[PDB]
Design a binder for this molecule. Structure first.
Ligand SMILES: [Cl-]
Length: 162
């Protein structure tokens, strides 16, 4: 297992514009297009991202290239952030995947509210961090996704994905 396989399991693959769990226009492997309610705005964002007139549909190769860009952007965002980088650098490779997964789903700003969880993770207090992570809108709105990610932080294994 690696971060790409983990997120492909969590996000799935759709080659036509769809709505995510919050109602936002998305395509591919969880690529957010826009938070605007306008399908035309989403189609414009898609064409800009791909570099051609897509009319709302992409190929598998295009979806995989967008996904690579999105994972890279999540990693770069962690490494540029003075609050996230020290925690990330303290984690082993499996738990680092759980960190990227959260940033991919919620962004740097979504993970801003997890300050207490981040401190517990840096201190390697895995069970306490797991309970604190679950006391969140994230866990209550996407509980199965959250349970898999939290289990990865708690155990440092891929068991939730096997
Ligand atoms: Cl879920």
């Amino acid at each position: 297992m690696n971060i790409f396989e983990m997120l492909r399991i969590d996000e799935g693959l759709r080659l036509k514009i769809y709505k995510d769990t919050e109602g936002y226009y998305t395509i591919g492997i969880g690529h957010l297009l826009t938070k605007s309610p306008s399908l035309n705005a989403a189609k414009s964002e898609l064409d800009k991202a791909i570099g051609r007139n897509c009319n709302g549909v992409i190929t598998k190769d295009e979806a995989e290239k967008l996904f690579n860009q999105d994972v890279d952007a999540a990693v770069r965002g962690i490494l540029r952030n003075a609050k996230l980088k020290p925690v990330y650098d303290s984690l082993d490779a499996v738990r680092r995947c759980a960190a990227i997964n959260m940033v991919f789903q919620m962004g740097e700003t979504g993970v801003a509210g997890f300050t207490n969880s981040l401190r517990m993770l840096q201190q390697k207090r895995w069970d306490e961090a797991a309970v604190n992570l679950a006391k969140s809108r994230w866990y209550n709105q996407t509980p199965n996704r959250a349970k898999r990610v939290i289990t990865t932080f708690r155990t440092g294994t891929w068991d939730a994905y096997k």
